[PDB]
Known about the structure:
monomer, Immunoglobulin-like, 4-stranded antiparallel β-sheet, mainly beta, 0% helix
Amino acid sequence: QVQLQESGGGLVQAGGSLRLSCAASGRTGSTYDMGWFRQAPGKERESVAAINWDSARTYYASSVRGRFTISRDNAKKTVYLQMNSLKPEDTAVYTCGAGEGGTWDSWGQGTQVTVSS
């Protein structure tokens, strides 16, 4: 019943900030949240940044916590993350997801990010 789409995601040479806008629509008003994720071949899935739904803060990871920005639309239900000062390590499939009851079993279509240096 719920889904997650992205926009803007794509190739971006190192040093170039990328702005992603993920939108969520369906049914959720308990303890759900919205955060971006990533994944590589032969590897597992990891997260990047996620926001809670109440009044606390965001949830960044020690992989880009200091260079990547995160914000919301504050109109309907959309999240935006500005991946600045990118690096050749960020190059991966950025999949937008959501959580419920404290877990994260919601994902979108995904957006591959290609960097270099």
